[PDB]
A = this chain, B = another copy of it.
C-alpha cells in the first residue's frame, strides 16, 4: 500500500486547480512550489493536518526527494523545486517504488 503522503503529493501536484501554487515542471520529472506562504496556508491543510512548509519539506526529504537548485538563486537579488527519480507525471504506479526512510 502506497503511503498517504505520496498519493496526496501526487494528487495535489497533478491537480490543475492548484497549478498556480504547485505544479509539474514541463518535463514532468519534478514539481515547483510558487509562493510558499500561500501554498502552505491554502493547499497543505486540505491534504494534511498542518499548514507548515517545514513539515512538508521534512516529508519530502523522508521520501528521497531532493531539492533542485536554480543557478538564479544565491544572490542578493519564490520558486522551489523538488524531484525524485520515481515521481514522474503520468506514472502514478511508480509511487509504489518510493520507499520511506527508516
Q: How many copies of the chain does the oligomer comprise?
A: 3
Q: Which residues of chain B have C-beta atoms less than 8 A from A51's C-beta? A: 76
- Assess whether A71 is in contact with B37, with CB atoms less than 8 Å apart: no
| Size of A's binding interface in residues, CB under 8 A | 24
> Which chain B residue lies CB-closest to A45?
B76
Q: Flag the segment in A4-12, A16-24, A25-33, A94-102 that touches B.
A: A4-12
Which residues in window 60-100 of A have CB below 8 A to B? 69, 71, 74-77
- Assess whether A75 is in contact with B47, with CB atoms less than 8 Å apart: yes
**Beyond A8-B71, A11-B71, A46-B77, 13 extra complex contacts between A and B, CB < 8 Å:** A4-B69, A4-B71, A37-B40, A37-B41, A45-B77, A46-B75, A46-B76, A47-B75, A48-B75, A49-B49, A49-B50, A49-B74, A51-B76
